[PDB]
Scaffold this motif. Structure first.
Motif: not given
Ligand SMILES: COC1=C(OC)C(=O)C(C/C=C(\C)CC/C=C(\C)CC/C=C(\C)CC/C=C(/C)CC/C=C(\C)CC/C=C(\C)CC/C=C(\C)CC/C=C(/C)CCC=C(C)C)=C(C)C1=O
Lengths: 94, 488, 101, 58, 100, 324, 174, 54, 64, 43
Positions: A68, F314-316, F319, J26, J29-30
């Motif tokens: 990512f 993608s991040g959500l 996560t 986005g 969050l990570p």
């Protein structure tokens, strides 16, 4: 398996036949604009971006956080480039 | 996880700084509030600062660059050799950038993107030096080449600059395709691209009758690409035209930085590798052809830049002689020659850039320079006699090793070629001294005095050239250190 | 992701921590580390100011130079602190707070 | 209620789409004996070829 | 005999690129296109070899080479455009001023 | 394989009938909006109007102007028509109702869309008309510009599904249709489809009164007909793609036995018909942008938002570990 | 046989790329070479690469070439030349390259001659690797962004250089 | 000017709200009777003053 | 040599490559690892297997 | 006084501001929430 590609080839052959029938039946009875080059360049860059997204999108489940963030860095470089494009007037057709 | 990236702190810093400079330049060059100010010199100073900080980060963290070597192994390999090569490359980039400010101001070259492309090509050459796989090597070479193609056509309204860019692009793409073909052949024959895997597979057999023709031709095509890169005959004709047609700072940068990066690549791909003397014969014959053609063509030149280009071709021939002999002293002398040629070339291009404010184009334009600027005429003469190899100047080391390796490796034709080419070179170098000191032209050209940057760099390089042989031990020891880091 | 900090050349000084965390390395900053950081940040701001006068943007140029200097100075200090804690650099101070604590 | 005139060509298009689906569905099922399987992978192919022997040689 | 035939396909593409260089002294656009043919032939070799050796390293390099080919075509056509703009023609007699 | 051409024709011929009747439906809907009738004399309720128009075009003499590119002039409509047709080989109408169950179907569709631009550019240059050429250049640039946003939206759906198989993309929406959590993405996709099809408000080729000549101005008889059939088949395909990616494809609205009674092909057809109605309703509702305005929208609005939605989704998903 | 057909189509199309009088026609024949290459890739089982050659080489690169070469309006006189005089030099170079290079794999990869015996029953089948199959897409995506991510990022740097160069060389703002 | 009124126009722009009314009013005449004359069975109105064939 | 197979499993010739590499990791004469090296290359190209089968084909053709 | 510059930027460039917020969520969050959940799970 590539087995599902054969029907596509036969489909292409049949579509070509239909097109030739349709188009053949009636036979019986100095200025360069740099902005087009520029839009081609931008399209090429973002087309490669979509290309590198397809393996990533299907592989997010296994690359986890590392993949990512590597993609995020890739996007960051290309978005710095895009911002440079914006500020230089490449996105304005006026 | 974070500490693994201590191996790439210099590259991370320089890339991020380049991004910062790109954003700064684009934001304030388009600003109506500040009347669209030229930012080539502002960004140039900030980029010189960035290069110096990268050099500090690399030099100080010498052991840390080898950290997490197993994790980073399939991407690059950092060791003593790459450490010193990268330090040299950064110093060369800094000197080249320092010589650009008068050009930015007086010519009014206002493009800050020139500095950004130089920084990105520096990142590319940094990655070239540490490359340890054909894929990484190719990608870094290509980043470097693309930056060079863009900057060579930077004077986009000039016939000469556009022509140089076009010839550069076409011939460089051709050679890059040839090299990529070589890599594909090697991969298909051995199933490997990492340099260690290639070292194991090839060692012990060379040409043992049942010779893999795929490996042979892969080596051949890769060598052709490398020989194009180092301007070696017969893959050389692009270099004089591109050197002449590009803007003079571009020519200065191309004559030094890319040689260090690709010779690092050559030493790590072949010396670290294993094949017959075939490749050594390749470089031997190219060295002989390069000396002969460079000498004669330089003798034919009437313009300063073309003369310097052909002189560089002759000297790469002299340098490649050291690679051919295949000894530890051969590699040491190759490194010493590259170092001394880089310093001498920076000296010469500082003088040329100083004289370009008055648009020096021909050798005859230097007439009566011993009268109109006596100290400058002496400095250029010291450089020209160093180029000719006359002792006790620093340029004599290359001549000395050329003849030493020949009478040791047993070569006598090479000694004859060296003698004749050295004499021809002495003639066409002392022609410049004769023009500045002996001629009495009817019309003189009075040159504007140089800025402080070029004068300081010139003073330091002139002291090095005249005095290196009095205290040469650090260079000898560091080059010997590097030569051994390649094998053990 | 399998990771391995193992370096090619072994540390020549006592290893206080082979893989120190980010916060631990930062908390290990010495006065010399803050001196190196401040010198690099000040030089960068000075170069930004002086190089920005001619275009007329000395303020923004100072900001840009200061950002480059802050980044590089933190990097240099983190490098030094982490190398001391891993035993790559002379770290008699780190060993003192390890034997004692 | 005059607007039903426009819902005739739209209904015709919908029927054409239903034909595009079902006609190819039934032809395949008739020729292969069973309806088409979505997701036929290497394993499903290996099974079919082995089943052919397992059936014919018994 | 599969591998040899795939390889000779790539071979003919590479050879056609070389021939396009040889045959187009007055047509530098086709010289650029011949270079692109050579790059496609190498990209195919990597894919064919990756399949033949059962190894994924050929495919990674194939993608990265496609990126290089795109960038090199973009910049090359830019240099073409600026050369044309300066001269008003693409004829090779107007790009030969630097010599000697 | 002997039965494959039967399936292929069972796809192609009803598609051509559907296109012929989509043109009639658009004329009827635009007319009803405008208090008129639209075709209603040639056949009952105008139902034979497409047959008459096609037969008229067949009998019309082909001009084929005195150009120096006669082969390319005639091949250009054949290229765009074949491309419009071939996209339907991978479209599923119900579970198991699909000609080619491509595992790379999403990327195949992207490739077809990328190929579509060539018919338009070749028509412009081969037609020996400066006006046709400048129109073709503008149309091609607009199409490639909106391809980027289409591709980024496709990537968003791919991240949600984790597979390029269209049937799997449908079956991933059993829990919920993607159009509910990705409604702005669906709106962006529908607008990008409008611009990609050269449709109102983005129909430069129809802007003849705007001194903007179309790429097909020099075409007569069945070359013009092939261009038209290709564009309308693409409209149907874009409606189908909007249905598949965001409205659950052949899935019913609610997972109840009362809804599960009617076949999934009917569900799919209903949703496609709703998007085909929107294509016409929008044509009837608004004026058109200038070329510069729509290019600005493509590069300055839809691309940044598509990239932002890729990042956010993608991040959500990574996560909270909700990835497929 | 199918490889023979694709090889012949690619050979003729490439000859047309390098020998067409009109460069626009050369670009269109280049698109035909890329389609043929994509068919070859499909035969190799690499569907992602076969589709990506269409998306990138034809969809983006060839469109760039077509846009540029069309707006140039090149007259045949500026690029024309009789090529009969190049038959001998091309003959020599092509024959040398052919003999040395079309048979470079023959000694290393000796072909298996097709016997008049069913050697297709000697195909051993392992079901362990067929339980969960990876597509070529997933196999590539497993590696690009984690184990070889540095090369990925360097490719991004290459693309950024392309964008900057395109602007600095051609931009004339209004 | 004010965070609410800034938010008001930002949402109105992003959500294309004014184009919703354009769609709504285009649909109202859809279900309404048409004004088309069925020529030649039906004719348009004329007056006794109409100037036609001599 | 990398071990990444094109179908998501260990490469076909990876074990041969490794055994070659372990051998060379402690044998000072490369001729001590000749057998493993030619095993790895035989896995790569199947040269000797195909040559022997072509011998069989040649003898069959001769005796027909 | 950088509090109404953001206001004017949001008024003038709503699409850009929306894109920045969406991508920022986005990315946030990570970088923040995901380590928080990882730390919570271990304990
Ligand atoms: C005003 O805008 C419009 C057009 O373009 C401007 C149209 O072309 C059209 C109409 C064009 C068509 C209906 C073309 C239809 C063609 C087909 C459905 C495929 C072939 C169908 C046929 C009846 C022809 C059969 C031909 C044969 C040679 C027989 C073979 C069996 C309309 C209605 C329109 O409104």
């Amino acid at each position: 398996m590539m087995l599902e590609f054969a029907p596509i080839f036969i489909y292409l052959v049949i579509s070509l036949l239909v097109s030739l029938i349709l188009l053949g039946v009636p036979f019986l009875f100095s200025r360069f604009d740099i902005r087009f080059y520029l839009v081609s360049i931008l399209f090429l860059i973002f087309d490669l971006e979509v290309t590198f997204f397809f393996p990533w999108a299907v592989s997010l489940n296994k690359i986890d956080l590392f993949g990512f963030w590597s993609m995020m860095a890739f996007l960051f470089i290309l978005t710095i480039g895009f911002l440079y494009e914006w500020k230089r007037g490449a996105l304005d057709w006026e | 996880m974070f500490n693994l990236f201590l191996a790439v702190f210099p590259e991370i810093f320089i890339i991020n700084a380049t991004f910062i400079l790109l954003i700064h330049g684009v934001v304030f060059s388009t600003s109506k509030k500040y009347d669209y100010p030229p930012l080539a010199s502002n960004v140039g100073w900030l980029g010189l600062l960035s290069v110096l900080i990268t050099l500090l980060l690399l030099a100080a963290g010498a052991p840390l660059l080898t950290i997490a070597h197993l994790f980073w192994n399939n991407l690059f390999r950092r060791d003593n050799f790459t450490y010193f090569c990268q330090i040299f490359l950064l110093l060369s980039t800094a000197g080249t950038i320092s010589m650009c400010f008068d050009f930015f101001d007086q010519e009014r070259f206002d493009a800050f993107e020139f500095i950004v492309l130089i920084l990105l090509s520096t990142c590319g050459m940094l990655f070239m030096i540490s490359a340890y796989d054909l894929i990484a090597m190719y990608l870094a070479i290509e980043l470097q080449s693309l930056c060079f193609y863009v900057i060579a056509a930077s004077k986009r309204k000039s016939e000469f600059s556009t022509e140089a860019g076009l010839k550069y692009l076409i011939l460089g793409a051709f050679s890059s395709g040839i090299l990529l073909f070589g890599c594909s052949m090697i991969y298909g024959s051995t199933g490997a691209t990492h340099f260690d895997q290639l070292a194991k597979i090839l060692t012990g057999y060379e040409i043992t009758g049942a010779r893999s023709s795929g490996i042979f031709m892969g080596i051949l095509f890769i060598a052709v690409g490398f020989l194009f890169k180092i301007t070696a005959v017969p893959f050389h004709m692009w270099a004089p035209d591109i050197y002449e047609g590009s803007p003079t700072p571009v020519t200065a940068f191309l004559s030094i930085a890319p040689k260090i990066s690709i010779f690092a690549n050559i030493l790590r791909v072949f010396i670290y590798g294993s094949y017959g003397a075939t490749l050594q014969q390749i470089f031997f014959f190219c060295s002989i052809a390069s000396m002969i053609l460079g000498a004669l063509a330089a003798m034919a030149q009437t313009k300063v830049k073309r003369l310097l280009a052909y002189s560089s071709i002759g000297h790469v021939g002299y340098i490649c002689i050291g690679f051919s002999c295949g000894t530890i002293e051969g590699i040491q002398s190759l490194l010493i020659g590259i170092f001394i040629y880089a310093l001498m070339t920076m000296d010469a291009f500082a003088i040329v850039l100083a004289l370009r404010q008055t648009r020096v184009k021909y050798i005859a334009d230097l007439g009566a320079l011993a009268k109109t600027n006596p100290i400058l005429a002496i400095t250029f003469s010291i450089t020209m006699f160093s180029y000719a190899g006359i002792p006790p100047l620093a340029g004599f080391c290359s001549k000395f090793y050329l003849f030493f390796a020949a009478l040791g490796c047993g070569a006598y034709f090479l000694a004859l070629v060296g003698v004749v080419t050295s004499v021809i070179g002495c003639f066409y170098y002392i022609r410049l001294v004769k023009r500045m000191f002996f001629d009495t032209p009817r019309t003189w050209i009075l040159y504007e005095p140089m800025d402080r940057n070029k004068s300081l760099l010139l003073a330091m390089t002139s002291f090095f050239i005249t005095l290196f042989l009095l205290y040469p031990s650090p260079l000898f020891s560091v080059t010997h250190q590097m030569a051994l880091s390649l094998y053990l | 992701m399998n990771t391995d900090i193992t370096a090619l050349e072994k540390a020549q000084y006592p290893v206080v921590d082979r893989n120190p965390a980010f916060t631990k390395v930062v908390g290990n900053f010495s006065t010399l580390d803050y001196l190196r950081f401040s010198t690099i940040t000040g030089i960068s701001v000075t170069v930004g100011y002086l190089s920005g006068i001619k275009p007329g943007i000395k303020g923004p140029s100072m900001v840009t130079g200061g950002l480059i200097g802050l980044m590089g100075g933190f990097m240099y200090a983190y490098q030094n602190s982490a190398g001391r804690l891993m035993g790559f650099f002379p770290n008699d101070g780190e060993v003192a707070s390890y034997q004692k604590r | 209620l005059v607007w039903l005139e426009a819902m005739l060509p739209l209904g015709i298009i919908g029927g054409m789409l239903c034909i595009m689906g079902n006609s190819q569905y039934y032809i395949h099922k008739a020729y292969h004996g069973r309806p088409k399987h979505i997701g036929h992978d290497e394993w499903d192919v290996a099974m079919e070829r082995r089943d052919k022997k397992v059936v014919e040689k018994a | 005999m599969d591998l040899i035939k795939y390889f000779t396909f790539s071979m003919i593409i590479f050879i056609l690129g070389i021939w396009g260089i040889l045959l187009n002294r007055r047509n530098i656009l086709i010289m650029l296109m011949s270079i692109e043919l050579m790059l496609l032939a190498v990209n195919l070799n990597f894919l064919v070899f990756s399949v033949s050796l059962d190894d994924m390293m050929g495919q990674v390099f194939a993608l990265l080479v496609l990126t290089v080919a795109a960038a090199e075509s973009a910049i090359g056509l830019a240099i073409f455009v600026i050369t044309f703009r300066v001269r008003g023609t693409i004829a090779v007699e107007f790009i030969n001023s630097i010599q000697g | 394989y002997i039965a494959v051409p039967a399936e292929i024709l069972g796809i192609i011929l009803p598609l051509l009938l559907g296109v012929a009747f989509l043109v009639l439906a658009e004329r009827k809907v635009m007319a009803f909006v405008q208090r008129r009738k639209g075709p209603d004399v040639v056949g009952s309720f105008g139902l034979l109007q497409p047959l008459a128009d096609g037969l008229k075009l067949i009998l019309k003499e082909p001009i084929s102007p005195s150009s120096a590119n006669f082969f390319l002039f005639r091949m250009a409509p054949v290229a765009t028509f074949m491309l419009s047709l071939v996209a339907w080989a991978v479209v599923p109408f119900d579970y198991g109702m699909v000609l080619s169950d491509l595992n790379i179907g999403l990327l195949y569709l992207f490739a077809i869309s990328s190929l579509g631009v060539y018919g338009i550019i070749i028509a412009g240059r081969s037609s020996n008309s400066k006006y046709a050429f400048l129109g073709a250049l503008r149309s091609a640039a607009q199409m490639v510009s909106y391809e980027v946003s289409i591709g980024l939206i496709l990537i968003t759906v791919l991240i949600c599904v984790g597979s390029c198989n269209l049937s799997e993309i449908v079956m991933a929406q059993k829990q919920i249709w993607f159009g509910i959590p990705l409604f702005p993405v669906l709106v962006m996709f529908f607008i990008s489809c409008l611009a990609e099809t050269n449709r109102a408000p983005f129909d430069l080729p129809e802007a003849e009164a705007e001194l903007v000549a179309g790429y097909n101005v020099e075409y007569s008889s069945m070359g013009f007909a092939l261009f038209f059939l290709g564009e309308y088949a693409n409209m149907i395909l874009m409606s189908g793609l909007c249905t598949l990616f965001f409205l659950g494809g052949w899935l019913p609205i609610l997972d109840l036995p009362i809804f599960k009674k009617i076949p999934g092909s009917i569900w799919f057809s209903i949703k496609v018909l709703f998007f085909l109605f929107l294509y016409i309703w929008v044509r009837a509702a608004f004026p058109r942008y200038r070329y510069d305005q729509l290019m600005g929208l493509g590069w300055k609005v839809f691309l940044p938002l598509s990239l932002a939605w890729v990042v956010s989704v993608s991040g959500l998903l990574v996560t909270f570990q909700w990835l497929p | 046989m199918i490889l023979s057909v694709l090889s012949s189509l690619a050979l003729v199309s490439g000859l047309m790329v390098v020998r067409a009088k009109n460069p626009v026609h050369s670009v269109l024949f280049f698109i035909l070479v890329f389609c043929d290459t994509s068919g070859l890739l499909l035969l190799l089982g690499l569907d992602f690469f076969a589709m990506i050659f269409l998306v990138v080489y034809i969809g983006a690169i060839a469109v760039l070439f077509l846009f540029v070469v069309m707006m140039f309006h090149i007259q045949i006189a500026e690029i024309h030349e009789e090529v009969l005089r190049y038959l001998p030099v091309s003959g020599i170079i092509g024959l040398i390259f052919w003999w040395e290079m079309f048979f470079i794999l023959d000694n290393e990869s000796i072909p298996l001659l097709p016997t008049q015996r069913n050697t297709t029953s000697l195909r051993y089948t392992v079901y362990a690797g067929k339980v969960r199959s990876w597509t070529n897409l997933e196999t590539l995506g497993n590696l690009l962004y984690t184990y070889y991510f540095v090369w990925f990022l360097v490719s991004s740097l290459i693309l950024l250089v392309a964008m900057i160069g395109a602007i600095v060389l051609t931009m004339h703002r209004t | 000017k004010d965070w609410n009124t800034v938010f008001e126009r930002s949402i109105n722009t992003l959500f294309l709200t004014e184009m919703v009314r354009g769609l709504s009013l285009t649909l109202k005449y859809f279900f309404d009777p048409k004004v088309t004359i069925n020529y030649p069975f039906e004719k348009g109105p004329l007056s006794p003053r109409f100037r036609g064939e001599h | 040599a990398s071990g990444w197979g094109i179908t998501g499993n260990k490469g076909r010739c990876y074990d041969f490559w490794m055994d070659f590499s372990e051998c060379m990791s402690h044998c000072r004469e490369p001729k001590d690892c000749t057998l493993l090296r030619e095993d790895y290359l035989e896995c790569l190209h199947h040269s000797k297997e195909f040559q022997r089968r072509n011998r069989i084909y040649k003898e069959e053709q001769r005796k027909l | 006084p950088v509090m109404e510059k953001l206001r004017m930027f949001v008024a003038q460039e709503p699409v850009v501001a929306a894109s920045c917020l969406i991508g920022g969520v986005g990315l946030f969050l990570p970088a923040v929430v995901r380590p928080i959940l990882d730390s919570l799970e271990a304990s």
